[PDB]
Amino acid sequence: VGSLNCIVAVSQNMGIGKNGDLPWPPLRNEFRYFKRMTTTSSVEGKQNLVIMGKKTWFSIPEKNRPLKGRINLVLSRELKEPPQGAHFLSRSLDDALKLTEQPELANKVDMVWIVGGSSVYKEAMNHPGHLKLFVTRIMQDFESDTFFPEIDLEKYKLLPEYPGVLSDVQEEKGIKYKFEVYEKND
Ligand SMILES: NC(=O)C1=CN([C@@H]2O[C@H](COP(=O)(O)OP(=O)(O)OC[C@H]3O[C@@H](n4cnc5c(N)ncnc54)[C@H](OP(=O)(O)O)[C@@H]3O)[C@@H](O)[C@H]2O)C=CC1
Ligand SMILES: Cc1sc2nc(N)[nH]c(=O)c2c1Sc1ccc(C(=O)N[C@@H](CCC(=O)O)C(=O)O)cc1
């Protein structure tokens, strides 16, 4: 299995969700960036694995589930089996990441992308080891009811370049945003 990564888009007030959807209106190219990053595998004959909480799964329009071209894993302790359309169910992050080591997935999975929500991001981010954060900074405040956890910049270095990530300010629907990549290893 290759690298471990989180990806998120977050407002200035650290918002990531409101009433089961995003705080901001649809940003088509920002969603396209999510799809390109999470789907693109560095490695022949492998796909990437996306790990998400149960509310995040059901927050994705059903027409777009499972996230195509990626192995979809949902985190839930209440569910008894993967939701309709999902591929795997795990009861904890550690369990998910261990599954990736099992014979079924061991040689199938390239990158692992944690795609939220808040609890899974916080655990991933505080877990020892080599981890990148792909963070889209939505450059306005938006009313939110779900927030991104604190990034500790003592450990997460903002990278001054990354191949394939545009460095200039984007704008869609009158909303400016910019892409960032953080890396720790502890
Ligand atoms: N802007 C962005 O990048 C992102 C936005 N969002 C937004 O965030 C909201 C959804 O996020 P959030 O409310 O945090 O919810 P989650 O997606 O984290 O779902 C929470 C549920 O997932 C299960 N769960 C979470 N973590 C684990 C774990 N480690 N192990 C086992 N089960 C776990 C639970 O289900 P159970 O009770 O069944 O055990 C828990 O009730 C929506 O508004 C969505 O649009 C989501 C991701 C990214
Ligand atoms: C769960 C996360 S992590 C994340 N990270 C960044 N940068 N931006 C986001 O908006 C999200 C979200 S919320 C989200 C909701 C729906 C979708 C979605 O429908 N994606 C489809 C469609 C992408 C497209 O519209 O092209 C896919 O990836 O195949 C993706 C992310």
Taking the CA of residue 118 as reference, the ligand 1 atom at the shortest distance is 14
DSSP string of 106-162, one letter each residue:
HTTEEEEEE---HHHHHHHHTSSSEEEEEEEEE-S----SEEPPPP-TTT-EEPS--
Query: Which residue CA neighbors atom 18 of ligand 1 most closely?
Result: 117
- Helix (H) or strand (E) segment spanning residue 31: helix 28-39
Atom 28 in ligand 2: residue holding the nearest Cα: 35
DSSP H/E element including 39? helix 28-39
Best CA proximity match to 148, nearest among 27, 8, 1: 8
Neighbours of 14 (CB within 10 A): 15
> Which residues sit opposite 164 in a β-bridge?
none
What are the CA-CA distances from residue 170 to residues 23, 53, 134, 142, 181 (Å)?
Answer: 18, 28, 15, 17, 15
From 34, 49, 51, 137, the mutation candidate for ligand 2 (largest count of ligand atoms within 8 A of CB) is 34
Query: CB under 6 Å to ligand 1: residues?
Result: 8-9, 16-17, 20-22, 52-56, 59, 75-79, 91-93, 115-120, 123, 146
> Ligand 2 in contact with 136 (CB < 6 A)?
yes
Experimentally determined by: X-ray
CB 42 within 8 A of CB 20: no
Residue nearest to atom 9 of ligand 2 (CA): 9
Select 1-186's CATH number: 3.40.50.720, 3.30.70.1350, 3.40.430.10, 3.30.1320.10.
Answer: 3.40.430.10
Residue 184, strand partner residues: 131
Q: What is the resolution of this structure in A?
A: 1.5
CA distance 14 to 78: 28
- Tell me how far apart the alpha carbons of residues 79 and 165 are, in angstroms, rounded to a whole number: 36
Q: Are residues 107 and 49 in contact, defined by beta-carbon separation less than 8 angstroms?
A: no
- Cite the active site residues: 22, 30
**CA separation for the pair 117, 34 (Å, rounded):** 15
Q: Which candidate, 139, 101, 111, 93, places its Cα nearest to that of 7?
A: 111
Q: How many residues does the chain have?
A: 186
The kind and range of the H/E element at 95 are: helix 93-99
DSSP label of 60? S
